[PDB]
Design an enzyme around this catalytic site. Structure first.
Site, PDB file in Angstrom:
ATOM      1  N   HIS A  88       0.852  -1.189   0.000  1.00 35.20           N
ATOM      2  CA  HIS A  88       0.000   0.000   0.000  1.00 35.20           C
ATOM      3  C   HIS A  88       0.884   1.234   0.000  1.00 35.20           C
ATOM      4  CE1 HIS A  88      -3.596  -2.379   0.746  1.00 35.20           C
ATOM      5  NE2 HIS A  88      -2.877  -3.056   1.672  1.00 35.20           N
ATOM      6  N   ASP A  91      -1.282   8.781  -1.747  1.00 32.82           N
ATOM      7  CA  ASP A  91      -1.252   9.940  -2.653  1.00 32.82           C
ATOM      8  C   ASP A  91      -2.148  10.986  -2.027  1.00 32.82           C
ATOM      9  OD1 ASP A  91      -1.927  11.843  -4.813  1.00 32.82           O
ATOM     10  OD2 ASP A  91      -2.223  10.186  -6.284  1.00 32.82           O
ATOM     11  N   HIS A  93      -3.744  14.492  -2.735  1.00 38.29           N
ATOM     12  CA  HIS A  93      -3.997  15.510  -3.770  1.00 38.29           C
ATOM     13  C   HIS A  93      -3.661  16.909  -3.292  1.00 38.29           C
ATOM     14  CE1 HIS A  93      -7.126  13.124  -6.357  1.00 38.29           C
ATOM     15  NE2 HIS A  93      -6.015  12.421  -6.241  1.00 38.29           N
ATOM     16  N   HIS A 128      -5.607   9.039  -1.296  1.00 37.03           N
ATOM     17  CA  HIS A 128      -5.963   7.660  -1.642  1.00 37.03           C
ATOM     18  C   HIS A 128      -4.726   6.820  -1.862  1.00 37.03           C
ATOM     19  CE1 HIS A 128      -5.223   7.980  -5.992  1.00 37.03           C
ATOM     20  NE2 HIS A 128      -5.761   9.196  -5.942  1.00 37.03           N
ATOM     21  N   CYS A 129      -4.884   5.513  -1.759  1.00 37.10           N
ATOM     22  CA  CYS A 129      -3.818   4.556  -2.085  1.00 37.10           C
ATOM     23  C   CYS A 129      -3.671   4.506  -3.595  1.00 37.10           C
ATOM     24  CB  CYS A 129      -4.192   3.216  -1.472  1.00 37.10           C
ATOM     25  SG  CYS A 129      -2.917   1.950  -1.684  1.00 37.10           S
ATOM     26  N   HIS A 139      -7.472  -0.592  -5.331  1.00 36.04           N
ATOM     27  CA  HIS A 139      -7.321  -0.213  -3.925  1.00 36.04           C
ATOM     28  C   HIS A 139      -8.274   0.914  -3.568  1.00 36.04           C
ATOM     29  CE1 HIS A 139      -3.478  -2.333  -2.587  1.00 36.04           C
ATOM     30  NE2 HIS A 139      -3.820  -2.896  -3.725  1.00 36.04           N
ATOM     31  N   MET A 144      -9.833   2.508  -0.071  1.00 36.60           N
ATOM     32  CA  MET A 144      -8.596   3.187   0.413  1.00 36.60           C
ATOM     33  C   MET A 144      -8.569   4.640  -0.066  1.00 36.60           C
ATOM     34  SD  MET A 144      -5.591   0.421   0.759  1.00 36.60           S
ATOM     35  CE  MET A 144      -4.758   1.453   1.937  1.00 36.60           C
ATOM     36  N   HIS A 249     -27.042  16.847  -2.624  1.00 36.99           N
ATOM     37  CA  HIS A 249     -28.235  17.655  -2.402  1.00 36.99           C
ATOM     38  C   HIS A 249     -28.716  17.423  -0.973  1.00 36.99           C
ATOM     39  CE1 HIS A 249     -32.046  19.572  -3.508  1.00 36.99           C
ATOM     40  NE2 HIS A 249     -32.598  18.769  -2.719  1.00 36.99           N
ATOM     41  N   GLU A 273     -29.002  24.404  -5.149  1.00 36.99           N
ATOM     42  CA  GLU A 273     -29.889  23.285  -4.837  1.00 36.99           C
ATOM     43  C   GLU A 273     -29.084  21.998  -4.764  1.00 36.99           C
ATOM     44  OE1 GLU A 273     -32.993  22.245  -7.941  1.00 36.99           O
ATOM     45  OE2 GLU A 273     -31.786  23.555  -9.256  1.00 36.99           O
ATOM     46  N   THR A 274     -28.245  21.743  -5.743  1.00 35.16           N
ATOM     47  CA  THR A 274     -27.475  20.517  -5.945  1.00 35.16           C
ATOM     48  C   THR A 274     -26.111  20.967  -6.445  1.00 35.16           C
ATOM     49  OG1 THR A 274     -29.480  19.312  -6.379  1.00 35.16           O
ATOM     50  CG2 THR A 274     -27.406  18.339  -7.214  1.00 35.16           C
ATOM     51  N   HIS A 300     -27.954  13.194  -5.975  1.00 39.55           N
ATOM     52  CA  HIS A 300     -29.231  13.360  -6.650  1.00 39.55           C
ATOM     53  C   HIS A 300     -29.288  12.638  -7.998  1.00 39.55           C
ATOM     54  CE1 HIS A 300     -33.242  15.000  -7.229  1.00 39.55           C
ATOM     55  NE2 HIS A 300     -33.187  15.604  -6.030  1.00 39.55           N
TER      56      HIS A 300
END
Ligand SMILES: OC[C@H]1O[C@@](CO)(O[C@H]2O[C@H](CO)[C@@H](O)[C@H](O)[C@H]2O)[C@@H](O)[C@@H]1O
Ligand SMILES: OC[C@H]1O[C@@](CO)(O[C@H]2O[C@H](CO)[C@@H](O)[C@H](O)[C@H]2O)[C@@H](O)[C@@H]1O
Ligand SMILES: OC[C@H]1O[C@@](CO)(O[C@H]2O[C@H](CO)[C@@H](O)[C@H](O)[C@H]2O)[C@@H](O)[C@@H]1O
Ligand SMILES: OC[C@H]1O[C@@](CO)(O[C@H]2O[C@H](CO)[C@@H](O)[C@H](O)[C@H]2O)[C@@H](O)[C@@H]1O
Ligand SMILES: OC[C@H]1O[C@@](CO)(O[C@H]2O[C@H](CO)[C@@H](O)[C@H](O)[C@H]2O)[C@@H](O)[C@@H]1O
Ligand SMILES: OC[C@H]1O[C@@](CO)(O[C@H]2O[C@H](CO)[C@@H](O)[C@H](O)[C@H]2O)[C@@H](O)[C@@H]1O
Ligand SMILES: O=N[O-]
Ligand SMILES: O=N[O-]
Ligand SMILES: O=N[O-]
Ligand SMILES: O=N[O-]
Ligand SMILES: O=N[O-]
Ligand SMILES: O=N[O-]
Ligand SMILES: O=N[O-]
Ligand SMILES: O=N[O-]
Ligand SMILES: O=N[O-]
Ligand SMILES: O=N[O-]
Ligand SMILES: O=N[O-]
Ligand SMILES: O=N[O-]
Ligand SMILES: [Cu+2]
Ligand SMILES: [Cu+2]
Ligand SMILES: [Cu+2]
Ligand SMILES: [Cu+2]
Ligand SMILES: [Cu+2]
Ligand SMILES: [Cu+2]
Lengths: 341, 341, 341
Positions: A88, A91, A93, A128-129, A139, A144, A249, A273-274, A300
């Site tokens: 494993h 990362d 971001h 994330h892996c 993964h 993950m 939403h 709204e969304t 939604h």
């Protein structure tokens, strides 16, 4: 030791809750110390008891939310216990260089590694892996992934010179899952992640999840685990999706201030709204509750929400505002003198 | 009666047209009275005559566009005639509280209910049926969705202190449909919505529509039902999608001013080629036509547009502008002296 | 000749590279002359050697990037050699009128046509073939799409009165492909595009690509064809997708300035992790590299990235910045005195 800053150890908490932190701070930069321990385990992912071979940071889907401030350094100890079967890595971001840290954190079962990254970019971000190749999606869709929030040192603002402060914060990690079925349509069970892989990859290839869940399973945030709030509270809802788009939403509410791309250097949008979480990102919405009662928080695509697992609830305490909404007439028989063509 | 405002009854019109309204107004807040009558009925949804068991507000897909101004109150009488088979309700994404009104409007066949909501949020918004559980997606993808526009009292603006006024408005409701097929691939027919449910839910689960239509069927807004405009007119195109993402594009034009998230407190984007309606939302685009002729208005998944039903036409009258575009040389044989490697 | 401007012939280059151009210019408007030659041909699209019946502008997927400035006129000679089997045309999303030019450019094999459009709208835009009806999606997903960039005459800016200048530019065209399979799951081969059509249309209808590729094939921009950069360079990455959404992400980097809707009249967003290219559009991101090494550039549906072909690499030369990121401790056995529960 070249980097001469104070060190602060953070104890992570399980989602949807968030570890203790300051919004605004006048402390200077620190080295913020976090520990993530990989756990491969079978987990229950729906209300019928379906299991699948999960892979997690810290035993949860999503992994826990990390919170730091702009200019802090984040020193992460990633641990891969020898009870696990796979290598494993991680990362971020939020980080700059080496594939987000993945190129510096590959660890076999029985190993740990220590990565430091400078929090130069504000916002909420996925982590994330990503071991390499086809193992990257596998993964991630096995669980993950999590998120990190890098707050401005002055806390949030509206992009128009006004400070915004939340009363409460929740982290909603959404997970697309790809559970194999047998020829009759029943979900299959396996004894290890490795045994599940080939059949899982075939489902993955067709880009249609079998489940879309919040906090790791259908119904995780409904029932006794509804999210609490009160009328008047400004609630920050962080939403991540490491692999696939979502459209959050709040049923009965709005997004007062929404960073759909999730990055606090950009002014939020108002009164949504969304909103839209692009796969591979986190976004965030602030809402000040104005009415008590139950709220559903969904993606939604209502098929995904109602039929594949992607509904959470808020239970909001307070007094009803009949100015905003009222039932003028309760259900009653259609009047005989009515014409309804 | 506690709320002492003038009352105005609005007569709704079928999409894509919009009832009479003012853009800017100096009238004060009113109680704007609307009636929606649920109609379950078989409807034709494609050019080969395929039918399906629809459920509608006011007999149309989409339901009609409601238009009010910020600060008005919206008093909706929802009617469920006894010829219908199912309970129904209504969720206004424009409204605050009680699941958008759904928790106050569940009515059995033979009943009606009256809901009032205050129009505190500007923009275009979805409204849809949401009875509970798996019935929520089913009722929505069976056709039970429309939109409401809450205009600022001063009408639209460009977000930079300039008023914007439309000459014409159209409402494009896009509907994803999930029609069962038999083992040979032919679409199945049913005698009631209840009979269609189980097979329909199986199609829904795989998240791939069989049809994506505007105004309730493939070809609804082409041919003799193309949308009319003239060179020079500023046309507002409201687009909704209650369940699934869309990417509108006006072929041969642009979006001069686009509110893709659909909320007028945010400045529009300018000069878009294609915009994005997140499932569960409405958005809007203004375009001033500069050229006569036929325009196609599509979702720019061109498979959906051309092969699943999602194309409308505009027919625009006026004079061609050869400065903007011209055919310098009509099709002709490739010259003998050409080299085209 | 009514239009009395200087004429400049541009020689196009194959993606991901871009023909020579000025960012800012003090030249006045010109007629910028481009030639596109349609080529139907079998092409290899994945690392196992799968072929499919492609249709291209200028022999590449994507078609080449055209670059002009606001107010220029673009005079395109579209050639359909007689070795091709189908009619073709071209729709510029940058252009106004006649379905983007498609209604003025339909040519049979053996013909050419000359279209002029005025570059009145700034941004990056898709261009694509669109013969009519079901041929529109088919030609586009067979490869007949590219992009054009219309720069402001003063070059790019940050939307806050600061000029932005790129050191390098790359054009990433992403292509969704729909390759038929036989009953065993093996990809089928055909002798002509016409022979492939019926089976391809069936795959298209289910809205799930078999491949998602950059620069026409899996692995096109990895290995010896990685994209070069240097620490300190500001790189513009234009990304297009003519039919289907994408969510670009630079692994180990960010989008410093991102026009996700792709239109330079709108201020970019800052500091993005992942952005969103709506199907039927081009967008662009600027990033200043801060670290050397390998970067992966993906769509962040990681299944698509790793398993369906949608990964490119950057190879960045320069010196590592341990302030931004460092491996504090290399992988090592978990200490005996550790507790990792
Ligand atoms: O595959 C759909 C088909 O399979 C069955 C079992 O034969 O149900 C499975 O699929 C359902 C939808 O995912 C689940 O609700 C259930 O846990 C699972 O066994 C059939 O009932 C369904 O008809
Ligand atoms: O701008 C966010 C803003 O939304 C607020 C506005 O003050 O309220 C909105 O909803 C309330 C419903 O009464 C109204 O004040 C307002 O007119 C409308 O946009 C807050 O909850 C907050 O500052
Ligand atoms: O299911 C695809 C397969 O089914 C058939 C009938 O056997 O056509 C059906 O599907 C088409 C695409 O949706 C429709 O055009 C038509 O209305 C429907 O019968 C086959 O023709 C197709 O090959
Ligand atoms: O800002 C919207 C604006 O688009 C306008 C600009 O005046 O026109 C655009 O298209 C026209 C094509 O001639 C040009 O005026 C302009 O230079 C370009 O962005 C209108 O139609 C309107 O105000
Ligand atoms: O259709 C999936 C199934 O088909 C086979 C061949 O029987 O593999 C094909 O599909 C794979 C995934 O797309 C490709 O990697 C390969 O090029 C293709 O033959 C099976 O191996 C797979 O199990
Ligand atoms: O605004 C784009 C900006 O990003 C820059 C800011 O100067 O840098 C970001 O990343 C760098 C990593 O050191 C930092 O300067 C900065 O504090 C952070 O947002 C440039 O690369 C550029 O102008
Ligand atoms: O240093 N002040 O919290
Ligand atoms: O297991 N996750 O919340
Ligand atoms: O090598 N990864 O499972
Ligand atoms: O309004 N919620 O589906
Ligand atoms: O009250 N004026 O329209
Ligand atoms: O039936 N709808 O327009
Ligand atoms: O109960 N709804 O059909
Ligand atoms: O440009 N329209 O597909
Ligand atoms: O006319 N100057 O480049
Ligand atoms: O064939 N295309 O790069
Ligand atoms: O007619 N087009 O292939
Ligand atoms: O962070 N990249 O998948
Ligand atoms: Cu892993
Ligand atoms: Cu990533
Ligand atoms: Cu209903
Ligand atoms: Cu809703
Ligand atoms: Cu073509
Ligand atoms: Cu197009």
């Amino acid at each position: 030791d070249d980097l001469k800053l104070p060190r602060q150890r953070v104890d992570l908490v399980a989602p949807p809750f968030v570890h203790v932190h300051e919004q605004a701070t006048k402390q200077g930069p620190k080295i913020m110390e976090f520990k993530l321990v990989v756990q491969e385990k079978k987990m229950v992912i729906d209300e019928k008891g379906t299991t699948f071979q999960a892979m997690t940071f810290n035993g949860s889907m999503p992994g826990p939310l990390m919170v730091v401030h702009e200019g802090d350094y984040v020193e992460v100890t990633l641990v891969n216990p020898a009870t696990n079967t796979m290598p494993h890595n991680i990362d971020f971001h939020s980080a700059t260089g080496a594939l987000g840290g993945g190129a510096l954190t590959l660890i076999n079962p029985g190993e740990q590694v220590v990565l430091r990254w400078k929090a130069t970019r504000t916002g909420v971000f996925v982590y994330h892996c990503a071991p390499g190749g086809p193992m990257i999606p596998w993964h991630v869709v096995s669980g993950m992934n999590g998120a990190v929030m890098v707050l401005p040192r002055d806390g949030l603002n509206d992009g128009h010179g006004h400070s915004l402060r939340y009363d409460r914060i929740y982290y909603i990690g959404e997970q697309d899952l790809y559970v194999p079925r047998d020829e009759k349509g029943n979900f299959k069970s396996y004894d290890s992640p490795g045994e599940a892989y080939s059949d899982t990859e075939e489902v993955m290839r067709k880009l249609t999840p079998t489940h879309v869940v919040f906090n790791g399973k259908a119904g995780a945030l409904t029932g006794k685990n509804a999210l609490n709030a009160n009328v008047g509270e400004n609630v920050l809802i962080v939403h991540s999706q490491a692999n696939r788009d979502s459209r959050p939403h709040l049923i009965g509410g709005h997004g007062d201030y929404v960073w759909e791309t999730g990055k606090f250097s950009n002014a939020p949008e108002t009164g949504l709204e969304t909103w839209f979480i692009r796969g591979g990102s986190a976004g965030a919405a602030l809402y000040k509750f104005l009415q008590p009662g139950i709220y559903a928080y969904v993606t939604h695509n209502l098929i995904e929400a109602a039929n594949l697992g992607a509904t959470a609830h808020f239970k909001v305490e307070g007094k009803w505002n009949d100015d905003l909404m009222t039932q003028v007439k309760a259900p009653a028989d259609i009047p005989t003198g009515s014409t309804n063509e």
